[PDB]
A and B are shown apart, each in its own frame.
With several copies, the nearest count.
Chain A
């Protein structure tokens, strides 16, 4: 077990807003 607590809701909301996809389908890799 370890001590851990949820972050403030406001911070979590804004953080989750800005999360771009790591891998995307690009038809070009040349």
Chain B
């Protein structure tokens, strides 16, 4: 997915969402945020979507 070769659709009914505000003048790659989010998913529950 990180490479431009795959697109994934995750079917969620409803979920808690959180969001971060960045500066448009600062280039960045947002992969670490998702990886952190993935790092805390388990069959018991999930953290809020960033």
Contact = CB atoms under 8 A, between A and B. Distances in A.
Contacts, number: 14
B39 A19 contact: no
Size band of the B side of the interface? under 10
B38 interface: yes
B39 A23 contact: yes
Main secondary structure of the interface of A (DSSP, over half): loop
Interface in B26-44: 38-44
Nearest to A23: B39
A1 to B, nearest CB: 20
Interface of B: 38-44
Interface of A: 15, 18-20, 22-23
